[PDB]
Amino acid sequence: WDYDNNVIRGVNLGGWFVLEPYMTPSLFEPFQNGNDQSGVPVDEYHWTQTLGKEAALRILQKHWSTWITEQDFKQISNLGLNFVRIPIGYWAFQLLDNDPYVQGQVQYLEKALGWARKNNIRVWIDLHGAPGSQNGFDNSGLRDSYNFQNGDNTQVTLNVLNTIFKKYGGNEYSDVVIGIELLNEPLGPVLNMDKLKQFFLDGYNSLRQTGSVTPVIIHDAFQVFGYWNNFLTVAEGQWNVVVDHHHYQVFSGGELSRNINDHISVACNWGWDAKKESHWNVAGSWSAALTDCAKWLNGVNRGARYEGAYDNAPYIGSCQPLLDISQWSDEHKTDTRRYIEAQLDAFEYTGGWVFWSWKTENAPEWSFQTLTYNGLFPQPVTDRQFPNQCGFH
Ligand SMILES: O=[N+]([O-])c1ccc(O[C@@H]2O[C@H](CO[C@@H]3O[C@H](CO)[C@@H](O)[C@H](O)[C@H]3O)[C@@H](O)[C@H](O)[C@H]2O)cc1
Numbered sequence: 001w002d003y004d005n006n007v008i009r010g011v012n013l014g015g016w017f018v019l020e021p022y023m024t025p026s027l028f029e030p031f032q033n034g035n036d037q038s039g040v041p042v043d044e045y046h047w048t049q050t051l052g053k054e055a056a057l058r059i060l061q062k063h064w065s066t067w068i069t070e071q072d073f074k075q076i077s078n079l080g081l082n083f084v085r086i087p088i089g090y091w092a093f094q095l096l097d098n099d100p101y102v103q104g105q106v107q108y109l110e111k112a113l114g115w116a117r118k119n120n121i122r123v124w125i126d127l128h129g130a131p132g133s134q135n136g137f138d139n140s141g142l143r144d145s146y147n148f149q150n151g152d153n154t155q156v157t158l159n160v161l162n163t164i165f166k167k168y169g170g171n172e173y174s175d176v177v178i179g180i181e182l183l184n185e186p187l188g189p190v191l192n193m194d195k196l197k198q199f200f201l202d203g204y205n206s207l208r209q210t211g212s213v214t215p216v217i218i219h220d221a222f223q224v225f226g227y228w229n230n231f232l233t234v235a236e237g238q239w240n241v242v243v244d245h246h247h248y249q250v251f252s253g254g255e256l257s258r259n260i261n262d263h264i265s266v267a268c269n270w271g272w273d274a275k276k277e278s279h280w281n282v283a284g285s286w287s288a289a290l291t292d293c294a295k296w297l298n299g300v301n302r303g304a305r306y307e308g309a310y311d312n313a314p315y316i317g318s319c320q321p322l323l324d325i326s327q328w329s330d331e332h333k334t335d336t337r338r339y340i341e342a343q344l345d346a347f348e349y350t351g352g353w354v355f356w357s358w359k360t361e362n363a364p365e366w367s368f369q370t371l372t373y374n375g376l377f378p379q380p381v382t383d384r385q386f387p388n389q390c391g392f393h
């Protein structure tokens with residue numbers, strides 16, 4: 001991959017190897033007692049634990065074997081995409097003592113790498129969940145825990161990375177894998193950043209020490225633009241390093257409160273800021289969402305800030321009419337198309353973009369398929385109904 005000249009146009013294969021209740025609510029809904037959600041497992045840790053090893057494996061094997069298949073990779077290619085980001089949890093490689101997680105993801109990851117090769121699609125392998133959790137998000141596997149830097153969890157994470165490095169950073173997949181992402185979304189504000197930097201450095205060095213020339217992808221840990229400019233630099237002989245920035249405008253009341261023009265201005269400025277940075281950078285996660293209305297987006301048994309139903313947030317608008325894309329107002333469809341186009345322009349201004357995510361069961365703001373089929377995601381992805389919203393130079 002030419003990170004200097006080529007632009008990544010990609011989708012995440014989210015909800016596949018790490019369960020996210022909002023992406024596959026059908027796997028979590030059976031635990032409901034009518035309208036009471038207090039008994040629904042909040043993450044994959046608790047879901048596998050509640051089910052037990054046998055049931056969890058049965059249900060996950062059906063999920064893994066159907067959620068993403070070769071046909072998805074064909075459709076991805078057909079739609080003009082050239083890339084997928086593949087989240088995977090540490091537990092696919094290594095279990096902590098007493099971990100309830102079941103394994104078997106690796107078989108499908110490797111099928112995926114073959115399907116990518118067959119369809120001329122490049123790949124990041126993304127270690128999306130670390131033992132103890134690096135962020136307390138349900139998508140780390142373990143909600144509301146922040147223990148990645150406690151005990152032996154960082155070392156276990158590095159051991160899992162070494163496994164990933166040896167299997168996937170070598171010659172076998174040199175034509176497919178164009179990045180290994182050390183850790184998805186470490187929650188910088190609650191972590192020791194010096195230790196996180198040392199972890200990134202250890203990972204970088206470990207990978208190169210294997211003889212691998214695979215790009216090392218470091219997530220920005222929610223730091224300000226430019227924060228990583230002086231870390232892992234060619235000045236220190238540290239090369240083939242890409243910063244992965246994630247961008248949304250839905251996870252606080254203040255962001256949700258913005259009018260569409262201001263949402264677009266924020267998206268444009270993501271582009272301007274990224275352009276100033278020293279490392280190659282890619283927007284590895286973003287979506288069309290202008291609300292946090294998707295059921296369980298904030299987590300199982302948590303409502304949406306958009307309708308004043310979470311975290312003492314005040315009401316902004318009703319979520320029910322936004323759950324089904326067939327029901328959207330023309331205003332929301334227009335706002336969505338404008339927002340997607342602004343983001344595309346912003347992200348192609350540097351290394352490109354990786355939409356979160358390829359598919360969801362019924363959350364349209366978060367599905368490349370659904371948005372495309374409804375004419376809201378440009379197809380071809382270069383199509384613009386709202387050209388030059390940002391005025392890039
Ligand atoms: O200031 N911060 O550092 C910060 C970090 C994160 C943040 O929002 C979190 O952001 C997390 C991650 O953002 C997206 O959240 C989506 C829904 O969980 C995931 O599917 C996407 O892959 C992911 O990129 C959310 O999971 C979580 O619910 C939400 O509270 C807000 C502020």
Ligand SMILES: OC[C@H]1O[C@@H](O)[C@H](O)[C@@H](O)[C@@H]1O
Nearest residue numbers: 238239240241242278279280
């Ligand atoms: O600065 C942009 C890029 O320059 C390349 O020569 C380096 O190998 C990368 O690590 C870096 O991100």
